[PDB]
Design an enzyme around this catalytic site. Structure first.
Site, short mmCIF file in Angstrom:
data_model
loop_
_atom_site.label_atom_id
_atom_site.label_comp_id
_atom_site.label_asym_id
_atom_site.label_seq_id
_atom_site.Cartn_x
_atom_site.Cartn_y
_atom_site.Cartn_z
N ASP A 189 -119.47 60.47 23.03
CA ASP A 189 -118.28 60.85 22.27
C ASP A 189 -117.70 59.60 21.63
N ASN A 244 -92.39 62.96 21.56
CA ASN A 244 -91.05 63.25 21.07
C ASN A 244 -90.69 62.28 19.94
N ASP A 249 -91.68 74.25 30.08
CA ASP A 249 -92.48 73.32 29.29
C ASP A 249 -93.05 72.16 30.13
N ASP A 265 -121.31 64.35 20.23
CA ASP A 265 -121.72 63.60 19.03
C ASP A 265 -123.09 64.08 18.56
N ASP A 302 -113.44 62.76 19.88
CA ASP A 302 -112.86 64.03 19.47
C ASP A 302 -112.99 65.13 20.53
N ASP A 326 -86.44 74.68 29.56
CA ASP A 326 -86.77 73.26 29.43
C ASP A 326 -86.58 72.55 30.78
N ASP A 333 -83.40 70.99 32.11
CA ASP A 333 -83.76 69.64 31.65
C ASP A 333 -82.52 68.77 31.42
N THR A 344 -91.10 67.49 25.76
CA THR A 344 -90.64 68.80 25.36
C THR A 344 -91.34 69.38 24.12
N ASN A 404 -116.60 59.13 18.60
CA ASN A 404 -115.41 59.35 17.76
C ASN A 404 -114.26 60.00 18.52
C1 LIG Z 1 -109.16 72.37 20.05
O1 LIG Z 1 -109.10 73.44 19.11
C2 LIG Z 1 -109.09 73.05 17.74
C3 LIG Z 1 -108.97 74.29 16.84
O2 LIG Z 1 -110.17 75.03 16.91
C4 LIG Z 1 -110.33 72.21 17.39
O3 LIG Z 1 -110.02 71.56 16.18
C5 LIG Z 1 -110.82 71.91 15.05
O4 LIG Z 1 -112.01 71.15 15.04
C6 LIG Z 1 -112.88 71.28 13.92
C7 LIG Z 1 -113.98 70.22 14.04
O5 LIG Z 1 -113.44 68.94 14.34
C8 LIG Z 1 -112.14 71.13 12.57
O6 LIG Z 1 -112.97 71.61 11.54
C9 LIG Z 1 -112.84 70.79 10.35
O7 LIG Z 1 -111.93 71.37 9.44
C10 LIG Z 1 -111.72 70.65 8.23
C11 LIG Z 1 -110.57 71.30 7.47
O8 LIG Z 1 -109.42 71.09 8.25
C12 LIG Z 1 -108.21 71.61 7.65
O9 LIG Z 1 -108.10 73.03 7.69
C13 LIG Z 1 -107.92 73.61 8.99
C14 LIG Z 1 -107.88 75.13 8.88
O10 LIG Z 1 -106.65 75.57 8.34
C15 LIG Z 1 -106.67 73.02 9.67
O11 LIG Z 1 -106.48 73.56 10.96
C16 LIG Z 1 -106.74 71.49 9.73
O12 LIG Z 1 -105.56 70.99 10.33
C17 LIG Z 1 -105.71 69.62 10.78
O13 LIG Z 1 -105.31 68.65 9.81
C18 LIG Z 1 -103.95 68.75 9.40
C19 LIG Z 1 -103.64 67.69 8.34
O14 LIG Z 1 -104.66 66.70 8.31
C20 LIG Z 1 -102.99 68.63 10.59
O15 LIG Z 1 -101.70 69.06 10.22
C21 LIG Z 1 -103.44 69.44 11.81
O16 LIG Z 1 -102.70 69.02 12.94
C22 LIG Z 1 -104.95 69.33 12.08
O17 LIG Z 1 -105.25 68.00 12.48
C23 LIG Z 1 -106.22 67.87 13.54
O18 LIG Z 1 -107.57 68.05 13.12
C24 LIG Z 1 -108.01 67.10 12.16
C25 LIG Z 1 -109.38 67.50 11.59
O19 LIG Z 1 -109.22 68.65 10.78
C26 LIG Z 1 -107.99 65.69 12.76
O20 LIG Z 1 -108.33 64.73 11.78
C27 LIG Z 1 -106.60 65.37 13.32
O21 LIG Z 1 -106.64 64.16 14.05
C28 LIG Z 1 -106.05 66.50 14.21
O22 LIG Z 1 -106.70 66.47 15.47
C29 LIG Z 1 -107.00 70.93 8.32
O23 LIG Z 1 -105.85 71.07 7.51
C30 LIG Z 1 -113.04 70.60 7.45
O24 LIG Z 1 -112.85 69.92 6.23
C31 LIG Z 1 -114.10 69.89 8.31
O25 LIG Z 1 -115.37 69.85 7.66
C32 LIG Z 1 -115.81 68.49 7.38
O26 LIG Z 1 -116.48 67.86 8.46
C33 LIG Z 1 -117.80 68.31 8.81
C34 LIG Z 1 -118.49 67.14 9.49
O27 LIG Z 1 -118.67 67.43 10.86
C35 LIG Z 1 -118.68 68.80 7.65
O28 LIG Z 1 -119.51 69.85 8.10
C36 LIG Z 1 -117.92 69.29 6.41
O29 LIG Z 1 -118.79 69.27 5.30
C37 LIG Z 1 -116.70 68.41 6.14
O30 LIG Z 1 -117.15 67.08 5.92
C38 LIG Z 1 -116.44 66.39 4.87
O31 LIG Z 1 -115.30 65.68 5.34
C39 LIG Z 1 -115.60 64.65 6.28
C40 LIG Z 1 -114.31 64.07 6.85
O32 LIG Z 1 -113.41 63.76 5.80
C41 LIG Z 1 -116.50 63.59 5.64
O33 LIG Z 1 -116.90 62.64 6.60
C42 LIG Z 1 -117.74 64.23 5.02
O34 LIG Z 1 -118.49 63.26 4.30
C43 LIG Z 1 -117.38 65.44 4.14
O35 LIG Z 1 -116.78 65.02 2.93
C44 LIG Z 1 -114.21 70.55 9.71
O36 LIG Z 1 -114.90 71.78 9.64
C45 LIG Z 1 -110.77 71.84 12.56
O37 LIG Z 1 -110.01 71.43 11.44
C46 LIG Z 1 -109.97 71.57 13.82
N1 LIG Z 1 -108.72 72.31 13.80
C47 LIG Z 1 -107.54 71.89 14.29
C48 LIG Z 1 -106.36 72.82 14.16
O38 LIG Z 1 -107.37 70.80 14.84
C49 LIG Z 1 -110.58 71.14 18.44
O39 LIG Z 1 -111.86 70.58 18.22
C50 LIG Z 1 -110.48 71.65 19.88
N2 LIG Z 1 -110.61 70.54 20.83
C51 LIG Z 1 -111.56 70.52 21.78
C52 LIG Z 1 -111.58 69.31 22.67
O40 LIG Z 1 -112.39 71.42 21.96
CA LIG Z 2 -117.59 63.40 19.34
CL LIG Z 3 -93.16 60.08 23.14
ZN LIG Z 4 -86.11 66.13 28.97
#
Ligand SMILES: *[C@@H]1O[C@H](CO)[C@@H](O[C@@H]2O[C@H](CO)[C@@H](O[C@@H]3O[C@H](CO[C@H]4O[C@H](CO)[C@@H](O)[C@H](O[C@H]5O[C@H](CO)[C@@H](O)[C@H](O)[C@@H]5O[C@H]5O[C@H](CO)[C@@H](O)[C@H](O)[C@@H]5O)[C@@H]4O)[C@@H](O)[C@H](O[C@H]4O[C@H](CO)[C@@H](O)[C@H](O)[C@@H]4O[C@H]4O[C@H](CO)[C@@H](O)[C@H](O)[C@@H]4O)[C@@H]3O)[C@H](O)[C@H]2NC(C)=O)[C@H](O)[C@H]1NC(C)=O
Ligand SMILES: [Ca+2]
Ligand SMILES: [Cl-]
Ligand SMILES: [Zn+2]
Ligand SMILES: CCCCc1ccc(NC(=O)C(=O)NCCN2CCN(S(=O)(=O)c3ccc(C)cc3)CC2)cc1
Ligand SMILES: [K+]
Ligand code: NA
Ligand code: NA
EC number: 3.1.4.39
Length: 806
Positions: free
Chosen positions: A683, A180, A308, A691, A687, A121, A261, A159, A685
């Protein structure tokens, strides 16, 4: 409730966590206040200390001792780490010459080289040089193994976000540990460093290495250690686990140190008090390596020594107070320190206005040591927006400074002299990476890389398929002797059209005009060639980008540039051009100032129109290939094609015009030619991903012309700058940016001055990896080079940071 009446007898540091209300004996039981009554007695023995001495050699086993020096200790797997040195005439690991580990040299029954992660750390990158005299074990790992000069952490450089990024390969916005300290509005729950909410699994997203291993049948040690377990006991526990029967033994382990740290916060990164913590960490590394040597594992295990984040000089007097800026300071909640996050104190307060708060915080004091941002306007390189736990209003705090709400928060919470959390490009925030073992290279230095990349490599080291993550798998192949991951290039999804001349001038009713009706088989044949791609090899140096999504687009050739024109977005997705060192800059001729020309290869219905720009009082336009860099007066006409036009706010045009008129030429002279690929990014949204059409929130008024949120450029040249960009035989050099397309220049406090005083500074702040641009555009670059794909992946992950030397 925990019934602590159970016993840890034969269960000390058990690997499977037992469920409540049964008492626990694992390395985290203390943290949960759940250890069995006899955990300290049985599992945290301290008698006689940690080192064998001459008189202890061959002793009768006393089970009360912290570690053993008896003859049976090797088979029991519980000797003190220095046993063989003291009692059997062996040398310490650090005193041995290093010898290349060409193949794993493992005891029978080992199915793979184990992986041991030694995480420290607050271990700032410069400690490797500056502390080298007092860290001989770490220095041997560094010089004999594979090392980077530094490793870039993620933002914020705190961290938990970084440790969990290491574990998952994910940006904090994706894994969910965004600071944190956190409030989640959906849970209506708060996450804190102190307390029990942080133990709830719902905070921790993605899939960490220990889960990835377990799901794929690779056993993992438990990575986390309760603070009160001494470092010596952590080491002995790991070494004991390594003596388990084959079927029970983990293949992956982690050690964690709270130092340096802990001391760095108190004394600053280079306080004279910092020498001792560095010595002590090195001693711990020595104990591990001596322990491994005893077990005949020192040429079998892969060891990763990794930090880290770093540590910066920060004191109480260097604090900015929001009470000096805001009248309404009690209507807000601030997450304070080395970053700021602001939200409304009460959701029931309809007087709360984020717009007026940002304005009151924008360029208000001459030397202001923080800058406010709406999270979507933060530099895209930080990837810090796409999470509900990240507040709309963010304060990027200058290195060496804090932000706080009111002065009373600072003296009724100087103590500290160090802190971290700042922008992850900051030199003082950089941290360390060393890989040592059979699977890493021997005596090899590798370029700096980002910690998001390591999860993939750790998966490679264990033969695991990584969960989907933000690393670019293969980009770190150059760290590895074996177990490289050999990715294939993504398949192109959309093939381009190659339109010829298909429309007459009079078919266009775009409200555009140009003074170009001022008119020879010698030159008419020549321009036909240019429109068919006769100069394409000069301007498209690395192949055309691949379009990795379903769309309709045209390749357009010109003398000076080539483009991929989207019929859907009515503008290029990319525009490619090469500028040699010798190229001359010219002006836009007076008669051509407002010239826009219909493109007879592209239908009126798939073109922009000038009237929409006339009618939209806020929006103007710019060009992707700059008219300033035309190869000749006649070629200049190509630059004014409607198919080279993009929507630009006047305030942004100041930035873009300076980049194009001044900076491109400057880079070409400095770098011996540059190839430039520029284009729009959408972009809305925030993300980090391209888009789709239905996600666009803004159009040029009265039209279907979508407004970009950002404009990118990728600037490539030869790494050996003795060769011109267009005749490069070896590795490439790249710098890129993703500039926010903003209607004001409020981000730049000095923008009322000449572009030469502020534009390049803005561009540097918005430096980017090619990979970031790929995510944002659905494009794949560098498809046709003479370079290995892994080398190209490393190039795509490169970030030009503009910091001085570490
Ligand atoms: C960096 O790498 C990561 C990992 O590869 C990339 O993130 C992925 O991006 C994908 C696209 O954005 C995304 O895919 C979606 O998955 C949905 C299911 O998600 C759940 O299951 C997965 C798998 O186990 C899990 O990992 C997810 O975990 C997230 O959410 C939990 C709790 O909410 C958190 O604990 C966790 O930290 C994580 O959160 C992060 O991601 C979510 C989005 O999932 C964000 O909201 C958070 O802010 C945070 O960043 C989930 O538990 C799946 O349902 C999606 O499909 C919907 O959307 C598309 C539309 O484009 C559509 O095709 C589908 O039909 C469906 O639509 C329906 O829902 C819509 C929204 O409610 C609605 O508008 C429609 O009308 C429909 O009803 C989608 O496929 C994937 O989950 C994440 N994974 C992770 C780990 O983040 C990331 O993009 C990379 N970054 C870069 C810059 O490249
Ligand atoms: Ca976007
Ligand atoms: Cl913080
Ligand atoms: Zn520290
Ligand atoms: C896979 C990459 C490895 C990164 C890697 C390696 C080691 C660790 N361990 C620790 O951080 C640790 O022991 N913290 C002690 C306090 N804990 C606070 C959190 N609740 C448990 C107690 C984490 C990540
Ligand atoms: K306009
Ligand atoms: Na005109
Ligand atoms: Na300004």
């Amino acid at each position: 409730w925990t019934a602590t009446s159970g016993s840890c007898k034969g269960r000390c540091f058990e690997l499977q966590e037992v469920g409540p209300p049964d008492c626990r004996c694992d390395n985290l039981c203390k943290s949960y206040s759940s250890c069995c009554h006899d955990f300290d007695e049985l599992c945290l023995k301290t008698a006689r200390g940690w080192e064998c001495t001459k008189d202890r050699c061959g002793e009768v086993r006393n089970e009360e001792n912290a570690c053993h020096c008896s003859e049976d200790c090797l088979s029991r797997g519980d000797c003190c780490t220095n046993y063989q040195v003291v009692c059997k005439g062996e040398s310490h690991w650090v005193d041995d010459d290093c010898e290349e580990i060409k193949v794993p040299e493992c005891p029978a029954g080992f199915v793979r080289p184990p992986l041991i992660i030694f995480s420290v750390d607050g271990f700032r990158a410069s400690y490797m040089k500056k502390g080298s005299k007092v860290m001989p074990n770490i220095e041997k790992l560094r010089s004999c193994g594979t090392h980077a000069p530094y490793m870039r952490p993620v933002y914020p450089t705190k961290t938990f976000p970084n440790l969990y990024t290491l574990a998952t390969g994910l940006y904090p916005e994706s894994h969910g540990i965004v600071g944190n300290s956190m409030y989640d509005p959906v849970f209506d729950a708060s996450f804190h460093l102190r307390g029990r909410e942080k133990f709830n699994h719902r905070w921790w997203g993605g899939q960490p290495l220990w889960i990835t291993a377990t799901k794929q049948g690779v056993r993992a040690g438990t990575f986390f250690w309760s603070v009160s377990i001494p470092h010596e006991r952590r080491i002995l526990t790991i070494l004991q686990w390594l003596s388990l029967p084959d079927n029970e033994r983990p293949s992956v382990y982690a050690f964690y140190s709270e130092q340096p740290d802990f001391s760095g916060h108190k004394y600053g990164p280079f306080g004279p008090e910092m020498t001792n913590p560095l010595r002590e960490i090195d001693k711990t590394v020595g104990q591990l390596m001596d322990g491994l040597k005893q077990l005949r594992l020192h040429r079998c295990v892969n060891v990763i020594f990794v930090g880290d984040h770093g540590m910066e000089d920060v004191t109480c007097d260097r604090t900015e107070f929001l009470s000096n800026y805001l009248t309404n300071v009690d209507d807000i909640t601030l997450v304070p320190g080395t970053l700021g996050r602001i939200r409304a104190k009460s959701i029931n307060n309809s007087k709360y206005d984020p717009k007026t708060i940002i304005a009151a915080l924008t360029c208000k004091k001459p030397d202001q040591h923080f800058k406010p941002y709406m999270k979507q306007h933060l530099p895209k390189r930080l990837h810090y927006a796409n999470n509900r736990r990240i507040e709309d209003i963010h304060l990027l705090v200058d290195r060496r400074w804090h932000v706080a709400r009111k002065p009373l928060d600072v003296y009724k919470k100087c103590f500290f002299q160090g802190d971290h959390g700042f922008d992850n490009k900051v030199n003082s925030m950089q941290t360390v990476f060393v890989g040592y073992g059979p699977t890493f290279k021997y005596r090899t230095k590798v370029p700096p890389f980002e910690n998001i990349e390591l999860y993939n490599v750790m998966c490679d080291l264990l033969g695991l398929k990584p969960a989907p993550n933000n690393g670019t798998h293969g980009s770190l192949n150059h760290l590895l002797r074996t177990n490289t991951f050999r990715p294939t290039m993504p398949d192109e999804v959309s093939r381009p059209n190659y339109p010829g001349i298909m429309y007459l001038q009079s078919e266009f009713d775009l409200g555009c005009t140009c003074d170009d009706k001022v008119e020879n088989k010698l030159e008419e044949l020549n321009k036909r060639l240019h429109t068919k791609g006769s100069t394409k090899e000069r301007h498209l140096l690395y192949g055309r980008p691949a379009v990795l999504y379903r769309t309709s687009y045209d390749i357009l050739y010109h003398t000076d540039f080539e483009s991929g024109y989207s019929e859907i977005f009515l503008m290029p997705l990319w525009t490619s051009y090469t500028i040699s060192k010798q190229a001359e800059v010219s002006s836009i001729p007076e008669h051509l100032t407002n010239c826009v020309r219909p493109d007879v290869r592209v239908s009126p219905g798939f073109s922009q129109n000038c009237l929409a720009y006339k009618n939209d009082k806020q929006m103007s336009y710019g060009f992707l290939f700059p008219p300033y860099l035309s190869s000749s007066p006649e070629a200049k006409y190509d630059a004014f094609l409607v198919t080279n036009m993009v929507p630009m706010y006047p305030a942004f045009k100041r930035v873009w015009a300076y980049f194009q008129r001044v900076l491109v030429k400057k880079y070409a002279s400095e770098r011996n030619g540059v190839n430039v690929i520029s284009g729009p990014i959408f972009d809305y949204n925030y993300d980090g991903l391209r888009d789709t059409e239905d996600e666009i929130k803004q159009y040029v008024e009265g039209s279907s012309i979508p407004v970009p949120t950002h404009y990118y450029s990728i600037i490539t040249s030869c790494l050996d700058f003795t060769q011109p960009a267009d005749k490069c035989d070896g590795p490439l050099s790249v710098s890129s940016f993703i500039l926010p397309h903003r209607p004001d220049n409020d981000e730049s406090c000095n923008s009322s001055e000449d572009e030469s005083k502020w534009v390049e500074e803005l561009m540097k702040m918005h430096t980017a990896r090619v990979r970031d641009i790929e995510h944002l555009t659905g494009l794949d670059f560098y498809r046709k080079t003479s370079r290995s794909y892994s080398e190209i992946l490393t190039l795509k992950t490169y970030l030009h940071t503009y910091e001085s030397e570490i």
